[PDB]
Amino acid sequence: ASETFEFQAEITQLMSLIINTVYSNKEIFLRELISNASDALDKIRYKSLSDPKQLETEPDLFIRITPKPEQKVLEIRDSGIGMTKAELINNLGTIAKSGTKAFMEALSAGADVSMIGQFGVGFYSLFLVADRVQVISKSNDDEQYIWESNAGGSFTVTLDEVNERIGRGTILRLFLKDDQLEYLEEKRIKEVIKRHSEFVAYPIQLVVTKEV
Numbered sequence: 001a002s003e004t005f006e007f008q009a010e011i012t013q014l015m016s017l018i019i020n021t022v023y024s025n026k027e028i029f030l031r032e033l034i035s036n037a038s039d040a041l042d043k044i045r046y047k048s049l050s051d052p053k054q055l056e057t058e059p060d061l062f063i064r065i066t067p068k069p070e071q072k073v074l075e076i077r078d079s080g081i082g083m084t085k086a087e088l089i090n091n092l093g094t095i096a097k098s099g100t101k102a103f104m105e106a107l108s109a110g111a112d113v114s115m116i117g118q119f120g121v122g123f124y125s126l127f128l129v130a131d132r133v134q135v136i137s138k139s140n141d142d143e144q145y146i147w148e149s150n151a152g153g154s155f156t157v158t159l160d161e162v163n164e165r166i167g168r169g170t171i172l173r174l175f176l177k178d179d180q181l182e183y184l185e186e187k188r189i190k191e192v193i194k195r196h197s198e199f200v201a202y203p204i205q206l207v208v209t210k211e212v
């Protein structure tokens with residue numbers, strides 16, 4: 001069962017700009033996604049204090065990055081609180097309206113794209129290196145769902161029936177642009193991670209497949 005929704009105008013406009021903008025330091029995208037993953041983890045951690053049973057679906061709290069060269073895909077996973085179907089719809093397709101509108105105005109005034117995080121809409125920076133994204137999420141309060149968008153003004157939400165079932169959390173599956181495959185490389189990914197992840201209180205796992 002697939003369902004389609006339209007983004008709030010302001011969000012679509014920001015996405016159009018980001019996916020086409022010529023930025024020379026696109027690696028900032030990872031910083032934003034790592035920060036969001038950390039926030040999701042803090043949320044499940046906090047809630048587990050009085051309700052530890054919430055952790056049983058996925059006992060370990062972590063962030064995991066897995067590049068998939070064969071598919072020109074980069075996955076950023078966290079075992080955070082996750083998002084129900086309603087949360088995916090609202091969080092990624094509506095609530096960012098004000099932040100995106102303000103950031104667009106900031107950019108028009110000369111702001112740098114690296115300021116996106118200051119406006120609470122860092123998520124959309126992924127379109128600097130990807131032309132399509134699948135958000136696979138599993139909240140303890142709902143079934144596993146897939147949110148997907150290619151920056152076409154609309155997005156779809158589908159009951160996950162093809163991906164691996166995760167205990168709890170969210171996976172950002174980025175379909176990298178042909179000229180942004182450097183982020184599939186271990187060395188490159190490692191340097192980008194260490195450059196801004198000093199604050200992360202959770203372990204950041206890197207899964208790489210190398211031939212011996």
Ligand SMILES: NCCCOc1ccc(-c2cn[nH]c2-c2cc(Cl)c(O)cc2O)cc1
Binds near residue numbers: 036040082091119
């Ligand atoms: N104004 C700042 C916006 C960031 O705030 C958050 C931070 C985390 C979440 C949240 C809850 N469950 N999953 C997420 C979540 C959201 C995004 Cl976009 C992400 O890349 C990873 C996540 O784990 C939701 C909102």
